[PDB]
Design a protein around this ligand. Sequence first.
Ligand SMILES: Cc1cc2c(cc1C)N1[C@H](O)C[C@H](c3ccccc3)[C@]13C(=O)NC(=O)N=C3N2C[C@H](O)[C@H](O)[C@H](O)COP(=O)(O)OP(=O)(O)OC[C@H]1O[C@@H](n2cnc3c(N)ncnc32)[C@H](O)[C@@H]1O
Length: 642
Amino acid sequence: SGVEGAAFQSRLPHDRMTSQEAACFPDIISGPQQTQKVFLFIRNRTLQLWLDNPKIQLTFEATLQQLEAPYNSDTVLVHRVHSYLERHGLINFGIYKRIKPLPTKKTGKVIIIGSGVSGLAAARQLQSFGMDVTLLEARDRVGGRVATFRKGNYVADLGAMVVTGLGGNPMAVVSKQVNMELAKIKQKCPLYEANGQAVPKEKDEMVEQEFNRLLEATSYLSHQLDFNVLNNKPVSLGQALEVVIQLQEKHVKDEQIEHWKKIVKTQEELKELLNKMVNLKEKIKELHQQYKEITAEFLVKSKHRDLTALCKEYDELAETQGKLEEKLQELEANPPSDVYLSSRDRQILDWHFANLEFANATPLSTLSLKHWDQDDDFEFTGSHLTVRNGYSCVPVALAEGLDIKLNTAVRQVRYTASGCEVIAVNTRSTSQTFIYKCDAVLCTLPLGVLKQQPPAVQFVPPLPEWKTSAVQRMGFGNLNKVVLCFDRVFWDPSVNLFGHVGSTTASRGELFLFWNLYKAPILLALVAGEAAGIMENISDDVIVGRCLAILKGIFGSSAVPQPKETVVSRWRADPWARGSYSYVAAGSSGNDYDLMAQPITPPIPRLFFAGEHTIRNYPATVHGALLSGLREAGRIADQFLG
Ligand SMILES: Cc1cc2c(cc1C)N1[C@H](O)C[C@H](c3ccccc3)[C@]13C(=O)NC(=O)N=C3N2C[C@H](O)[C@H](O)[C@H](O)COP(=O)(O)OP(=O)(O)OC[C@H]1O[C@@H](n2cnc3c(N)ncnc32)[C@H](O)[C@@H]1O
């Protein structure tokens, strides 16, 4: 299934046309289904040709010469499919050799706000389409939230560092184009408690099992019993989790109660049984006395078959007594669980919640119970990988040949029914400003900058209410890293990651996870959830000291030398980001991502949007950013080039 795999790798069903293709090829969708079969094959085959060699431009001509008969005869259809694929960034995207050099005459001018992956991806597309494009970047580097530290042989990412499974991932193509080295993340993640001792395989698995069960429960509660609103306030994932935990504790307490009652009941039956036996002994004594006084040949017989009958009674009770002392001791030896989670178990469980806070870049109490995993259905297949040589290799290579103006911060964006003006200032001399005129503006401003109050950049006219309302509802998280560069490796080189279990629920996200990913002796420590924003207020030295303390508790002091180099990110305080990435906040939904993607048009579309926050099925990702850029380049070219 070569062509079939090509469609998969392109996130398209191989045997049916998408709604997009239906709209662009209405004559095919509403026509002979045999022609649709032909359409799909041309489409799947063209994708295969491009995917099999993503370093070279796939021209219409080369596509035609590589298609087998009878397909190579339907010249017009092939061109229509090739044009569509190319326009929408499914082929000829990223970085590749052009066999058809760009035309000197550039049509239409577009200003791209932001030199991150979304802006870079859109820029390269728009340029290859023959448009005049210039990127305005506030920083003194490209890449935005993809940021790599490089010094000597030391390499470390302060922003994006993980690639999520290549099957269907556009980054698979970009990886090949820039020769980026990817290493699969080994699953083994040993956990160490606050005292530094490792958590036994048993408990680790047990608690991880409970974590999974608790999450599954919140999903059942949400997508079955429709428990998504309470007191008119949307329910958060954190909220639902604590409720599920409470029920588990209630259930444990109930089975404990019932058990104690079995004990008490058995204990009462015994006391009462012992009491009638004591009375039967007193009744036997009444006989082993008195009994012994000439008709006796019949009086002794009588007193005998009488005194014995009282033993066919007594030791008979000692029997029905042994069946209780047995039942009793059996119960007081097999007690149900005393608690749902021991104090130590709860801390380990909090580590798993912190991990989830890292993945969504926000405390669980802010996540939408109903929509936090709204995009799960779009995950790519395969192991998640890490960028051994620094993720910045992508934006750096994508910037090749582009007209990028660094140290240029945009402060105003004017858009009228007949053109656009973008005002920016030099960040090195806020005295001098710049005024760039253009036909269209592509804003790849991070959601955190768009939420900023007072606003960092002004829109004239101001953005619509349906747009600003979406920006306000959507969540924008935070996550930070501490890069520790050593001259020696004192950790287990075969382990990619290991966790640090915090002491309290509130600080569970503080330096809870360490990553071993590079050539040089470098460790990355994460700061998630509530800890992320707070720790930004701590100086590098103090935060590094707390890292070494964690490390020394694990590997022993004297084993951990002082770091030669350290880097600490503070994404929330970074004025060009104001956070790490978006998340679906309680009260928001995947629809806000669609609203974020909508162009603003006063008589015709003028202001466009790209960025990790404008792509519903792939939010908060580098690939999502990439795709949003390809998407917008297509929408813009359609408007200005037709
Ligand atoms: C910061 C950060 C982010 C991540 C991550 C870590 C950190 C510390 N990692 C996390 O460790 C895990 C997270 C992840 C892993 C697996 C699945 C999903 C996500 C990840 C990662 O590994 N992998 C990933 O794909 N994305 C990450 N993310 C998110 C991705 O990095 C982003 O979604 C993606 O890089 C976003 O690119 P973009 O093009 O949408 O936006 P920016 O790159 O922010 O560019 C906007 C530009 O506007 C510029 N600017 C600001 N004001 C200006 C103005 N008005 N005019 C001129 N320029 C302006 C800013 O400098 C900025 O460069």
